[PDB]
Design a protein around this ligand. Sequence first.
Ligand SMILES: [Mn+2]
Ligand SMILES: [Zn+2]
Ligand SMILES: [Zn+2]
Ligand SMILES: [Zn+2]
Ligand SMILES: [Zn+2]
Lengths: 49, 1603
Amino acid sequence: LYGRYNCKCCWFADTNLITCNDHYLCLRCHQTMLRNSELCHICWKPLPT
Amino acid sequence: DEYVQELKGLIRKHIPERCEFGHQKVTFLSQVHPSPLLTEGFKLLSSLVELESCEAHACQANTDQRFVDVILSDNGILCPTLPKVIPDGFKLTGKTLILLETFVRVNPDEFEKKWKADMSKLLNLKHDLQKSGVTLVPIVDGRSNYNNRFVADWVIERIRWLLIEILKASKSEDQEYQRLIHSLSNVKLENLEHLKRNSLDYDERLNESLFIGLKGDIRESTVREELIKLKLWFKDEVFSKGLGKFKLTDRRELLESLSSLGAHLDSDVSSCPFCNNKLMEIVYNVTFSCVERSNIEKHYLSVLSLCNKIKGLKVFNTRRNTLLFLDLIMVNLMVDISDSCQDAIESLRKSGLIVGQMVMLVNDRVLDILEAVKLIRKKIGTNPNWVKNCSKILERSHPEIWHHLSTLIKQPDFNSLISIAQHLVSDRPIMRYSKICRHKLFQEMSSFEQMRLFKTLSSISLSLINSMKTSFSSRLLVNEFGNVRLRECYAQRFYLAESLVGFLFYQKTGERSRCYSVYLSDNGVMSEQGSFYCDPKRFFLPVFSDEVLAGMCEEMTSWLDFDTGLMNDTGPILRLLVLAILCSPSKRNQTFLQGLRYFLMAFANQIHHIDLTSKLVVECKSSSEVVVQRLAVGLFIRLLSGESDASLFFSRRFKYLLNVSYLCHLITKETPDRLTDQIKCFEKFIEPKVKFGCAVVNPSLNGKLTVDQEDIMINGLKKFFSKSLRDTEDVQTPGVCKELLNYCVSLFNRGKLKVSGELKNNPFRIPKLDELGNILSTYDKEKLVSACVSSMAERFKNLDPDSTDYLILKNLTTQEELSLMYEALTEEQVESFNEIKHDVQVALAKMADVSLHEVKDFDPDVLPPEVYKELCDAVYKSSEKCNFFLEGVLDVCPLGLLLKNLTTSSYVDEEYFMCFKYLLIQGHFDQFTNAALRNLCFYSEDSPTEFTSISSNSGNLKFGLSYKEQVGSNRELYVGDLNTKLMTRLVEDFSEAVGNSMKYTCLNSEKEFERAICDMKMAVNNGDLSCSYDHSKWGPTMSPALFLALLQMLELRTPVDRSKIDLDSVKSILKWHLHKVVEVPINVAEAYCIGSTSLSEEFFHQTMQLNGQIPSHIMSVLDMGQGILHNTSDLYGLITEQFLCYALDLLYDVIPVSYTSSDDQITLIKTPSDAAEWLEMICFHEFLSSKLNKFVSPKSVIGTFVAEFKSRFFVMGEETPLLTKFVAAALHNVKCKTPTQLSETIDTICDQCIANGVSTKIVTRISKRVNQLIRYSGYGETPFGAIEDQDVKDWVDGSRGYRLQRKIEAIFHDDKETSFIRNCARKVFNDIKRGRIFEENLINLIGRGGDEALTGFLQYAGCSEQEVNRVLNYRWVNLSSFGDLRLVLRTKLMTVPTLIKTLQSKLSRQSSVASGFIGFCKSMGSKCVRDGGFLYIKEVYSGVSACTCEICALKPKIIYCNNSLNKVSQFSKPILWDYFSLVLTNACELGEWVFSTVKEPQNNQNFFWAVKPKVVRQIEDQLGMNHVLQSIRRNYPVLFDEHLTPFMNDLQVSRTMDSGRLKFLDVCIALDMMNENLGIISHLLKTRDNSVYIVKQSDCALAHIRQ
Ligand SMILES: [Mn+2]
Ligand SMILES: [Zn+2]
Ligand SMILES: [Zn+2]
Ligand SMILES: [Zn+2]
Ligand SMILES: [Zn+2]
């Protein structure tokens, strides 16, 4: 089972979240961290597509 | 008559030394009658005891039993109508009196109670005997056994046995017989059925007002119906109207309120940190003045140190002429230096140690040259031979060790000194007592001036700490508004660059707060930098920490590297905040930062109390708090504010802000003022009792209350239990409602809660109190004075030198020993010592034998100088006196002229107040029923025989009030007598057992604490409702009557008997506790009597003389002292909280589980089936908790994002590390008695710090700071020393021995010799494991030494003479070779290998840090290193030869070769032997992987993870007790017999070969006994205490691979 259905970067966004193979990412934080680099910076894995 | 007749025969072995002995024995032996026999025998035994005790003190036994009035009237002495007291032994001589009262008590309780009842009765007589008479010294001789020096110490117990047997055979009341037998046994818990428990017609109303509504049998359905109806009433009556206590978050309004309360807007202060605070301005001045811009000095420093050393011997019995002589020596040395080498007075003085027309002298003093020559011009013409006697006194009766060949006997030529004075003209300091801004805008400075600011702060703080070091018994030559022209002020120096130095001028000594003036000196041009006012003992943290703070700030800033542009604004702000915190330490900054922590906690969550923002505001004074509050609030707003893109990485933001709020740990917690803190503690203690209306005044202290006292007590008891379940008015006043308590008990009994009454392991298995904190109580002072006076009187069998004062140093803690024992005292300790000396001297003077004091306090010892000007005392003491003074100093000081000698010695010196006091003292300006006549010799009348509902016939449970130092606000503290301590111990053990039977409470059970931690972690990870409830006023609100009711309603069923234990003793002790008496501090009474508004001061003045007398004892209903009933309070809280969880589960269909720690709790609620529909439940829970005595604090929070319990914050995914807490803990608590213990302490702290993922770049800096602290004290660097630098993340799987081994391996570069030693150690280990298995024979090789042991091991494995000469060459210096460094450190008043001490500690069961370190540095400079005598450390280190044979230069001043220590070879030991011992012991400890060769290997700084140690033990891991004792007895019989196991009764198991001959413990226990820094046996008997290490992935990739 995954976590508690929260972005894990803002704690406050629970709506159509995306999984990062270990947690639930938000729709905007994913784009920001992807525009930054190729790493995840919150679980240290390759980010999804 | 079997024993009756044998008594007269057995007592025949008595020696009639005195006449009364025989006169009583002839009457006892010649009278056989059972009624006058027991009294005669008891009185004869008592007379023997008291006669021995009297003759022991050169006494005169009182054979007439006459009072003191008539014993004074025998001589010519007027009776001032003293109280009638019968003394046991008297001794009158001249005009002094010695009264001694002796007794005997066998148990400690009655011994203390009798001593504290006889000493007070003796002290109450001196106030009436001194007003119109003579002085007296009281002696109290108590003996805990009937032994003496007249019989062979074997007949006394036989006589005792015969007497008790005759008494129990036939008698002739009921309790006079139970006490006599109890007072003749030797030694003898609960079950006090021997007591009587007689009623007193007052306990009827107690039981009628305590147990009328308590039933405890209510059914289960009725509770459900009542709870349902109560909820239905609550929902529509007090919640839908808006009278709740909790509300939603609404972050925007939170930020608005923060900006309103923190960022001041109506203030006139500017936005510049350097303009408001003075110390920051001085730091800025010095920094931006320094940044942007030779045998003479050594000779001067050497002779100055020699003068400073000769000043410490006080070989002149005076202070003025001593300073004149030292000044003469110094000026003659200056004029002898200025004879030639013209480039010395301007080159090596201006750039060295000199200032404008001022020279440096002894005692860190600075003296004007013109004043110096003017004072040297005195003492000549009127005393022409002054230079002659001083020159011929430094040879005979003198150390005769001096280099003063010509600088001493020279006559000071004044013309050359005037030439020097006219060379450099006056530019003296100004000593400034009591708008344009140009300050470079800190935010836009380079990265080099800020480090310079930190370095300058470090330097000035070190100078302040050193200013605290100046001698106390020091008086300036001449004495002294807004500006004072300094001429004779003290000065300290600190170096900053090649040419410029900095001076710090002050005028006072001690540890008080002062005003300092900071100046600079570039090339002799003395400039001005500023002035400020501070307390020196609050600046110890930055003393050497200028690289630790920079590193922690740097990495705390790098935490925010997710946005390039956020850290660039928060870096300088954070650094400036740290600087402003360090330059202004105060309690208000601590309080504000704690409030910030709670604000962040409430911001992250969703529901919070409605009274929060009223707990965050602090009234800022001094205009220096305003800037720090603005900085902190600005940082909070910059990190938290925003509309949408303000939470991109919230874990990092929460961590940053929590560590920012935890910066309150940098400021010390050391009570800025003692009297103010005691006053505040008394306010906080007595305010709620006066608000409630039950605080009585001074009781009888015997268990007897008047009618009004019991009336008010019962009224308070009724008011406590008179709260209803509907009225919403009483939700903040103490008290409990009986209906809900009955529900709780009735539901607890019928196995419904999560705890039950199914317990196992049946639980029934001389200080004064009104002054807590004083360094010397009245009792100790009077005892010391009496002891000294009695000793001096017994010696006079007159004349006396100052050696008597030496006696006062012998019992409180040969000029060298006197100087070593006097210098270890603190300022107020010096004052108390002066008081004691004065009292003893006046007493001895009496033994040898202005009007405003008679009406006022007649004691001239406390005549204040603030009631009189200075000129009047200065002129009146120098008037005409013919027979008061005498010519000369009279060093021999014969008895009979001691007062004249003291007056003369005080008048010759500068101070005149002592002369005036001595003139006042010298001018006489101070002028057969066996129940009543049998309880006076040795009958322990005060023993517990019958008790009532309020006392125990032996007191009323007296306590004492004090405080405890904390970060935010101080805590309360109660210190009681011995009897009350025993009773509290009984009840606490009972309740601790009962709670140990329970499950959910976690206060003294670490497994339940770990279970709570796991539950909380899983809740925060899953998304359950976590409610962190901290309760307010838990101590001063609870009452023992609540526990009484709870226990009366309980049953506590036995495990397998089901007997319903009767709790009579527990309830009796609780009733005794309910009527306890608390004594108020005497300082508060004095401050409120001598004489802003205060409630407690109002109560004091209202109760001072209106109702009765000045309050000294306060009894009330509700105290429940903090730290007294801790366990019973925990039990009550557990029961009530389980009831509340049951009610919540019943009403709101949720699943709660709660953990409690007796003051705060955490409740984890799992809800069915976002979190806006749970406000009603929380408000209802708070209402019900208020219906019990469990008020909730506004700091409590409810949410689903963060959880707190015992200061341990758990968040989504991980846990916040709290870096700054551990760093500030490491920089503090430098408690040093030896460098080894300091190294070990900082090692443990750094280990527990790096366990919480701090860094490996900040621990090396703490290590270097501790190394520099050791080096600065004068001890020098050692191979082991403090913890190691350049460490790695291998604090896991590594003990202290392993990092010591790493340090020693790092000393050697190519690790060749260490490799050889390690290979030999591996050979020895493999040979002791199997093959040629060894035995205890190696023990006989270890106890010899270092050289022989190492060469024996080497020739055991295999070697030759080449290895003998090679390995044994590397030597280091061990000052602790013939013992340990002798030193008297800053301890409290009134006062062999270390493995033995550790085992003794295992078998059995207010001071500043800056002052302690100053005392340590001061003691490490005297004669400390022992030999054969004692000597200095620089004397030892000056005997080493600078050979430099390219083997002693690989690590200078640490490792030498053999021939470099030929001069001093007693202190020289091989380091390879210590390396071998450490390698072998680490092999014993944590595996055999410590033999391989170290190889080096071939990540965003935020990738953390948890790792476990990888140790493998080969020492039979269990390794319990009773194993080291057996091996110690085997190998060291004499050392096992003495110093070990006198307090041991289970030798049988430890002797019957209980798992004897351990695998490796046989040899790895002798290496620990001789090495004074190995210490593994004290480590094997201890847990890891960490068990897991959080570390970043960047460090785990750079470690060393040793396998
Ligand atoms: Mn708490
Ligand atoms: Zn998000
Ligand atoms: Zn991820
Ligand atoms: Zn400014
Ligand atoms: Zn050498």
